[PDB]
Design a protein around this motif. Structure first.
Motif, PDB file in Angstrom:
ATOM      1  N   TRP A 207       0.841  -1.187   0.000  1.00  0.00           N
ATOM      2  CA  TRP A 207       0.000   0.000   0.000  1.00  0.00           C
ATOM      3  C   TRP A 207       0.884   1.248   0.000  1.00  0.00           C
ATOM      4  CZ3 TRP A 207      -0.354   4.078   3.460  1.00  0.00           C
ATOM      5  CH2 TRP A 207      -1.383   5.010   3.190  1.00  0.00           C
ATOM      6  N   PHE A 208       0.539   2.218  -0.856  1.00  0.00           N
ATOM      7  CA  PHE A 208       1.184   3.540  -0.865  1.00  0.00           C
ATOM      8  C   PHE A 208       0.174   4.706  -0.909  1.00  0.00           C
ATOM      9  CE2 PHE A 208       1.011   2.595  -5.361  1.00  0.00           C
ATOM     10  CZ  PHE A 208       0.882   3.810  -6.008  1.00  0.00           C
ATOM     11  N   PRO A 209       0.476   5.812  -0.195  1.00  0.00           N
ATOM     12  CA  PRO A 209      -0.521   6.867   0.050  1.00  0.00           C
ATOM     13  C   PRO A 209      -1.003   7.597  -1.197  1.00  0.00           C
ATOM     14  CG  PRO A 209       1.300   7.041   1.587  1.00  0.00           C
ATOM     15  CD  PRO A 209       1.740   6.097   0.501  1.00  0.00           C
ATOM     16  N   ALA A 210      -0.170   7.686  -2.232  1.00  0.00           N
ATOM     17  CA  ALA A 210      -0.559   8.396  -3.467  1.00  0.00           C
ATOM     18  C   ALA A 210      -1.607   7.627  -4.294  1.00  0.00           C
ATOM     19  CB  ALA A 210       0.672   8.735  -4.320  1.00  0.00           C
ATOM     20  N   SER A 211      -1.799   6.342  -3.983  1.00  0.00           N
ATOM     21  CA  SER A 211      -2.859   5.537  -4.612  1.00  0.00           C
ATOM     22  C   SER A 211      -4.243   6.097  -4.278  1.00  0.00           C
ATOM     23  CB  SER A 211      -2.787   4.081  -4.155  1.00  0.00           C
ATOM     24  OG  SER A 211      -3.099   3.957  -2.776  1.00  0.00           O
ATOM     25  N   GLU A 212      -4.314   6.848  -3.175  1.00  0.00           N
ATOM     26  CA  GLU A 212      -5.560   7.424  -2.658  1.00  0.00           C
ATOM     27  C   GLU A 212      -6.569   6.353  -2.213  1.00  0.00           C
ATOM     28  OE1 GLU A 212      -7.144  10.697  -5.127  1.00  0.00           O
ATOM     29  OE2 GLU A 212      -5.106  11.239  -5.721  1.00  0.00           O
ATOM     30  N   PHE A 213      -6.081   5.134  -1.977  1.00  0.00           N
ATOM     31  CA  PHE A 213      -6.918   4.036  -1.501  1.00  0.00           C
ATOM     32  C   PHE A 213      -6.964   4.100   0.024  1.00  0.00           C
ATOM     33  CE2 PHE A 213      -7.821  -0.558  -0.624  1.00  0.00           C
ATOM     34  CZ  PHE A 213      -8.894  -0.765  -1.487  1.00  0.00           C
ATOM     35  N   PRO A 214      -8.174   4.245   0.611  1.00  0.00           N
ATOM     36  CA  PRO A 214      -8.248   4.292   2.074  1.00  0.00           C
ATOM     37  C   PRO A 214      -7.715   2.994   2.708  1.00  0.00           C
ATOM     38  CG  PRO A 214     -10.303   5.067   1.072  1.00  0.00           C
ATOM     39  CD  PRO A 214      -9.497   4.434  -0.020  1.00  0.00           C
ATOM     40  N   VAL A 215      -6.895   3.136   3.753  1.00  0.00           N
ATOM     41  CA  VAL A 215      -6.328   1.998   4.487  1.00  0.00           C
ATOM     42  C   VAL A 215      -7.442   1.093   5.050  1.00  0.00           C
ATOM     43  CG1 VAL A 215      -4.757   1.312   6.365  1.00  0.00           C
ATOM     44  CG2 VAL A 215      -4.250   3.352   5.034  1.00  0.00           C
ATOM     45  N   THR A 216      -8.546   1.711   5.465  1.00  0.00           N
ATOM     46  CA  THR A 216      -9.719   0.977   5.923  1.00  0.00           C
ATOM     47  C   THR A 216     -10.335   0.097   4.828  1.00  0.00           C
ATOM     48  OG1 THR A 216     -10.995   3.051   5.657  1.00  0.00           O
ATOM     49  CG2 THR A 216     -10.450   2.379   7.916  1.00  0.00           C
ATOM     50  N   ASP A 217     -10.099   0.430   3.560  1.00  0.00           N
ATOM     51  CA  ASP A 217     -10.650  -0.374   2.455  1.00  0.00           C
ATOM     52  C   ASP A 217      -9.850  -1.641   2.138  1.00  0.00           C
ATOM     53  OD1 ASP A 217     -12.898   1.218   2.235  1.00  0.00           O
ATOM     54  OD2 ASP A 217     -12.189   2.374   0.520  1.00  0.00           O
ATOM     55  N   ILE A 218      -8.668  -1.795   2.741  1.00  0.00           N
ATOM     56  CA  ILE A 218      -7.894  -3.040   2.586  1.00  0.00           C
ATOM     57  C   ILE A 218      -8.586  -4.189   3.323  1.00  0.00           C
ATOM     58  CG2 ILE A 218      -5.645  -4.214   2.889  1.00  0.00           C
ATOM     59  CD1 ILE A 218      -4.329  -1.387   2.916  1.00  0.00           C
ATOM     60  N   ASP A 219      -8.918  -5.247   2.585  1.00  0.00           N
ATOM     61  CA  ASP A 219      -9.559  -6.403   3.181  1.00  0.00           C
ATOM     62  C   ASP A 219      -8.472  -7.305   3.764  1.00  0.00           C
ATOM     63  OD1 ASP A 219     -10.940  -8.687   3.918  1.00  0.00           O
ATOM     64  OD2 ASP A 219     -12.100  -8.823   2.056  1.00  0.00           O
ATOM     65  N   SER A 220      -8.107  -7.017   5.015  1.00  0.00           N
ATOM     66  CA  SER A 220      -6.972  -7.631   5.704  1.00  0.00           C
ATOM     67  C   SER A 220      -7.108  -9.121   5.916  1.00  0.00           C
ATOM     68  CB  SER A 220      -6.757  -6.979   7.074  1.00  0.00           C
ATOM     69  OG  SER A 220      -6.867  -5.582   6.984  1.00  0.00           O
ATOM     70  N   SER A 221      -8.344  -9.620   5.865  1.00  0.00           N
ATOM     71  CA  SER A 221      -8.605 -11.050   6.008  1.00  0.00           C
ATOM     72  C   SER A 221      -8.028 -11.841   4.819  1.00  0.00           C
ATOM     73  CB  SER A 221     -10.106 -11.316   6.160  1.00  0.00           C
ATOM     74  OG  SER A 221     -10.793 -10.959   4.970  1.00  0.00           O
ATOM     75  N   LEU A 222      -7.686 -11.148   3.734  1.00  0.00           N
ATOM     76  CA  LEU A 222      -7.125 -11.805   2.541  1.00  0.00           C
ATOM     77  C   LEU A 222      -5.584 -11.862   2.514  1.00  0.00           C
ATOM     78  CD1 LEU A 222      -9.523 -10.090  -0.086  1.00  0.00           C
ATOM     79  CD2 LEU A 222      -9.901 -12.309   1.052  1.00  0.00           C
ATOM     80  N   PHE A 223      -4.938 -11.395   3.585  1.00  0.00           N
ATOM     81  CA  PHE A 223      -3.476 -11.258   3.604  1.00  0.00           C
ATOM     82  C   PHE A 223      -2.907 -11.739   4.910  1.00  0.00           C
ATOM     83  CE2 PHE A 223      -5.277  -7.616   1.294  1.00  0.00           C
ATOM     84  CZ  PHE A 223      -4.825  -7.932   0.016  1.00  0.00           C
ATOM     85  N   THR A 224      -1.640 -12.132   4.892  1.00  0.00           N
ATOM     86  CA  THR A 224      -0.910 -12.424   6.125  1.00  0.00           C
ATOM     87  C   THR A 224       0.036 -11.264   6.465  1.00  0.00           C
ATOM     88  OG1 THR A 224       0.889 -13.616   4.993  1.00  0.00           O
ATOM     89  CG2 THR A 224      -0.990 -14.932   5.715  1.00  0.00           C
ATOM     90  N   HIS A 225       0.452 -10.506   5.442  1.00  0.00           N
ATOM     91  CA  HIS A 225       1.443  -9.434   5.594  1.00  0.00           C
ATOM     92  C   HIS A 225       1.106  -8.286   4.672  1.00  0.00           C
ATOM     93  CE1 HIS A 225       3.636 -12.991   7.039  1.00  0.00           C
ATOM     94  NE2 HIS A 225       4.335 -12.153   7.783  1.00  0.00           N
ATOM     95  N   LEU A 226       1.191  -7.068   5.189  1.00  0.00           N
ATOM     96  CA  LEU A 226       0.938  -5.885   4.389  1.00  0.00           C
ATOM     97  C   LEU A 226       2.148  -4.952   4.437  1.00  0.00           C
ATOM     98  CD1 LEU A 226      -2.815  -5.588   5.363  1.00  0.00           C
ATOM     99  CD2 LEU A 226      -1.930  -5.742   2.946  1.00  0.00           C
ATOM    100  N   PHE A 227       2.534  -4.427   3.275  1.00  0.00           N
ATOM    101  CA  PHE A 227       3.672  -3.518   3.194  1.00  0.00           C
ATOM    102  C   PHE A 227       3.181  -2.083   3.048  1.00  0.00           C
ATOM    103  CE2 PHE A 227       5.286  -7.636   1.971  1.00  0.00           C
ATOM    104  CZ  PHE A 227       6.590  -7.688   2.416  1.00  0.00           C
ATOM    105  N   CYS A 228       3.703  -1.193   3.886  1.00  0.00           N
ATOM    106  CA  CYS A 228       3.400   0.226   3.781  1.00  0.00           C
ATOM    107  C   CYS A 228       4.617   0.937   3.187  1.00  0.00           C
ATOM    108  CB  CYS A 228       3.043   0.805   5.155  1.00  0.00           C
ATOM    109  SG  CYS A 228       2.714   2.597   5.147  1.00  0.00           S
ATOM    110  N   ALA A 229       4.410   1.654   2.080  1.00  0.00           N
ATOM    111  CA  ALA A 229       5.519   2.171   1.275  1.00  0.00           C
ATOM    112  C   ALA A 229       5.337   3.661   0.931  1.00  0.00           C
ATOM    113  CB  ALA A 229       5.622   1.342   0.001  1.00  0.00           C
ATOM    114  N   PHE A 230       6.378   4.495   0.998  1.00  0.00           N
ATOM    115  CA  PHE A 230       7.756   4.164   1.372  1.00  0.00           C
ATOM    116  C   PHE A 230       8.296   5.154   2.396  1.00  0.00           C
ATOM    117  CE2 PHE A 230       8.681   0.915  -1.651  1.00  0.00           C
ATOM    118  CZ  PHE A 230       8.000   1.226  -2.820  1.00  0.00           C
ATOM    119  N   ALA A 231       9.027   4.639   3.382  1.00  0.00           N
ATOM    120  CA  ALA A 231       9.926   5.451   4.199  1.00  0.00           C
ATOM    121  C   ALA A 231      11.136   5.887   3.338  1.00  0.00           C
ATOM    122  CB  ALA A 231      10.387   4.661   5.428  1.00  0.00           C
ATOM    123  N   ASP A 232      11.793   6.969   3.753  1.00  0.00           N
ATOM    124  CA  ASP A 232      12.861   7.575   2.977  1.00  0.00           C
ATOM    125  C   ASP A 232      14.188   7.456   3.705  1.00  0.00           C
ATOM    126  OD1 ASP A 232      10.903   8.545   1.027  1.00  0.00           O
ATOM    127  OD2 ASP A 232      10.369  10.064   2.529  1.00  0.00           O
TER     128      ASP A 232
END
Length: 344
Positions: free
Chosen positions: A8-33
């Motif tokens: 997931w990256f913030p410029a996608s404009e996809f709300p974090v709440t909209d991620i269906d976390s039940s479909l994943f074991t690991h989520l990547f938040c991108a990017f630190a600098d």
């Protein structure tokens, strides 16, 4: 045991709440600098709120989901990374800060996305960086009593990067896994013909494929259980020279749809519906494409994803990941991926 992952990256404009976390074991938040003056891992002030709440937010839809904070990414300053990795003191400030940041932001681990170390010098430094990084997360887990931070890295689809070889020994002993970037093989920015941008296979052996890269990694010593196979939730669009020539490797005049041709999976599905497009799943390469008039898009749809997930499971890989979670159509590909993994 199994990684089912997405970025997931913030410029996608996809709300974090909209991620269906039940479909994943690991989520990547991108990017630190990387701060090139201090050699520290930093989160931009713009990214600070969403990155710091990312984990507890995604855990609402799956309390068992784990998260990693990704560092660098496609547009990072590679000379800064090379300078950082070149010296024991700059590596230490990178390592120590990366660990503080992860803990303070509540991540379960860290993912280095240097794309890519492009010389034997950089590769040596890269390998040393990872070794010190592993020793450091081991040291912090014994010192804080907390579960050890996970360590991962996004890597070239092959261990052989245009004749520059990854330090596979350092990778295998230091990291929990690598994210194999088995995509961006063809695009109108560098290919004058259409092609499967993420092909699993290439019978003609004329170009890249995820299967060839994965096998090359395993041949070079990467345990299969340290490989996570990536696929794109986006494609590339070309402008056909002639509407009657629309297979792979067809003549084109350049990009369509966008400047470099890139288009998210959601927008591809819309293109298909709106244009009543011809759709092909090519099983020889494991890639999807569609066309209407002189617009031609190569991408991954359901059948490509399902085949790749099955390949990953059957060849003993740790799992799979997608770039990126905000381009899926109502979690359709991720849902297919998980179910395809669980059934195999």
């Amino acid at each position: 045991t199994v990684v089912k992952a997405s970025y997931w990256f913030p410029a996608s404009e996809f709300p974090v709440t909209d991620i269906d976390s039940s479909l994943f074991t690991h989520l990547f938040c991108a990017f630190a600098d990387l701060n090139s003056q201090t050699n520290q891992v930093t989160v931009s002030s713009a990214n600070q709120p969403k990155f710091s709440t990312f984990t507890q937010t995604v855990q609402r839809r799956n309390p068992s989901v784990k998260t990693l904070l990704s560092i660098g990414g496609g547009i990072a300053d590679k000379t800064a990374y090379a300078s950082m990795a070149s010296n024991p003191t700059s590596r230490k400030s990178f390592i120590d800060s990366s660990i503080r940041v992860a803990r303070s932001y509540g991540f379960h681990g860290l993912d280095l996305d240097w794309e890519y170390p492009s010389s034997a010098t950089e590769m040596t430094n890269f390998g040393t960086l990872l070794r010190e990084w592993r020793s450091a997360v081991v040291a912090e887990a014994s010192s804080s009593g907390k579960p050890r931070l996970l360590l991962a890295a996004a890597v070239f689809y092959s261990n052989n990067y245009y004749s520059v070889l990854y330090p596979v020994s350092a990778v295998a002993s230091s990291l929990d896994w690598v994210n194999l970037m088995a995509y961006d093989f063809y695009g109108p920015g560098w290919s004058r013909v259409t092609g499967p941008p993420a092909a699993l296979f290439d019978p003609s052996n004329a170009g890249p494929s995820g299967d060839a890269g994965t096998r090359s990694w395993i041949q070079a010593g990467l345990p299969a259980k340290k490989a996570v196979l990536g696929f794109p939730y986006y494609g590339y669009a070309w402008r056909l020279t002639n509407a009657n020539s629309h297979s792979y490797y067809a003549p084109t005049t350049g990009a369509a749809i966008s400047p470099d041709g890139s288009i998210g999976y959601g927008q591809i599905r819309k293109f298909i519906v709106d244009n009543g497009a011809t759709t092909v799943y090519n099983s020889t390469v494991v890639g999807d494409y569609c066309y209407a008039g002189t617009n031609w898009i190569g991408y991954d749809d359901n059948q490509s994803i399902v085949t790749k997930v099955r390949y990953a499971k059957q060849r003993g890989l740790l799992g799979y990941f997608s770039w990126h979670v905000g381009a899926d159509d109502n979690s359709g590909l991720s849902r297919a991926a998980s179910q395809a993994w669980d059934a195999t």
